Design a protein around this ligand. Structure first.
Ligand SMILES: [Mg+2]
Length: 193
RNA sequence: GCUAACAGACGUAAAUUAAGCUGCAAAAAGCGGUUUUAUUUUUGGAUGUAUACUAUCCGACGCCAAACGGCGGCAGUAACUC
């Protein structure tokens, strides 16, 4: 069902085709490659896939669901940002579009660089601040795919983890520069778990 | 005219974070005050709002004080009596 790169390099990364191989892995891989080819030039070779990519390949996801997922991923993030995000860690495709929308909106609320913890600068320069907030959240997602797993802790504990990082030295603007340069949120999320 | 009226529970409603503006003496940090926001918790009417809700009366429709509730006597006047 996949005359292409051999299964030997792919059986060591994906243990999903042991059970639901026939229509499942081949059609989902073909539809995902076509769904990213119809996007802005994404190849999606299967070698980069990690064993945590049981999602988007498990028996029960339709190819139409993958088509909606990639369309929602290039709708929630800009396709230049979505292409930069998908260059590293394709595990973002595992999330459902509604849950990914919820996590991105919660990240935009807590990490709002425009104003307060509330979504500052509601939509001339308010739209400019809102676009900067979308850029900041997509840059954090490019830097770390694990920030999309915030609702495992809570939608309201993103601020709690951010202050657990915040209490050491100074205020928010220094920390938006600091957290974008180093992954300080991973220890805070592990401390919350 | 809305946290409505009306009907009930009655000795009185507040709990946990977050952001902002801050302030005190001070060798590189602690505790606060105030405004806004988030989660709860905040009985029906009502997740309603004067074309809506409640109360009272008449009980469709058709034709000519809509609050309790009625709406007098005396003794005579019209070419035969009355
Ligand atoms: Mg009236």
């Amino acid at each position: 069902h996949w005359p292409s790169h051999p299964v030997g390099p792919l059986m060591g990364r994906i243990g999903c085709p042991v059970i639901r191989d026939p229509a499942g892995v081949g059609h989902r891989l073909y539809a995902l490659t076509r769904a990213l080819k119809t996007d802005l030039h994404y190849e999606l070779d299967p070698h980069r896939l990690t064993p945590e990519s049981e999602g988007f390949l498990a028996s029960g996801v339709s190819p139409f669901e993958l088509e909606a997922r990639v369309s929602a991923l290039v709708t929630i993030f800009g396709r230049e940002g979505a292409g930069r995000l998908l260059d590293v860690s394709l595990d973002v495709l595992t999330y459902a579009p509604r849950d990914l929308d919820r996590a991105v909106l919660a990240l935009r609320e807590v990490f709002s660089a425009a104003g307060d913890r509330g979504y500052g600068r509601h939509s001339p320069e308010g739209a400019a601040a809102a676009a900067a907030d979308r850029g900041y959240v997509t840059d954090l997602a490019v830097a770390w795919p694990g920030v999309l797993a915030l609702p495992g802790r809570l939608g309201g504990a993103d601020g709690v983890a951010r202050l657990l990082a915040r209490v050491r030295r100074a205020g928010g603007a220094r920390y938006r520069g600091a957290v974008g340069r180093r992954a300080l949120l991973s220890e805070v999320l592990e401390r919350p778990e």
